[PDB]
């Protein structure tokens, strides 16, 4: 195919005891900010305040292709929504 | 063997881009079409140009396009 290879991530909402998840397949050249927004929406949580971290407690810099994240941290990611104030 | 292109939809202020690799013999018409489809804009009215404002004749091999203009191209959707 002419279309770029995809990498896939298993993103878990660890905050939910059920450990639900969504698998996203994403073009390697995609800025990770797009992946985070897409994931937040699938989980119905605010993209602007949520974060994606690795299973070993590293924060993922969103200014980074999906390819890089895949290559450096593999496919198991966690989505972290913020608490509320007051 | 394949050559690769970064095509940026510059009319989308988010500047989203896609990467395409096609066999260096591929007619550039195929890439224009492919790019159109992926970008969800009409192949018939879309153009592909370079960063420096040169229009790419699609009746050319992707290989030759790569050789003359490099990988950085813009897709220009009609009105």
């Amino acid at each position: 195919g002419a279309m770029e290879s995809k990498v896939s991530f298993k993103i878990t909402l660890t905050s939910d005891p059920r450990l639900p998840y969504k698998v996203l397949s994403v073009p390697e050249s995609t800025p990770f900010t797009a992946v985070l927004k897409f994931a937040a929406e699938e989980f119905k949580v605010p993209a602007a305040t949520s974060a994606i971290i690795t299973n070993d407690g590293i924060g993922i810099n969103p200014a980074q292709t999906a390819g890089n994240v895949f290559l450096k941290h593999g496919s198991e990611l966690r989505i972290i929504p913020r608490d509320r104030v007051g | 063997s394949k050559v690769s292109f970064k095509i940026t939809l510059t009319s989308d202020p988010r500047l989203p881009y896609k990467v395409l690799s096609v066999p260096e013999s591929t007619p550039f018409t195929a890439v224009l079409k492919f790019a159109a489809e992926e970008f969800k804009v009409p192949a018939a009215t879309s153009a592909i140009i370079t960063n420096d404002g040169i229009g790419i004749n699609p009746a050319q091999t992707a290989g030759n396009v790569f050789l003359k203009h490099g990988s950085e191209l813009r897709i220009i959707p009609r009105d």
Binding site: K6, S25, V26, F38, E42 | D12, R14
Partner: peptide, 9 residues
């Protein structure tokens, strides 16, 4: 919009 072509699986 999904202008980066992300797919759910």
């Amino acid at each position: 919009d999904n202008e980066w072509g992300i797919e759910l699986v």
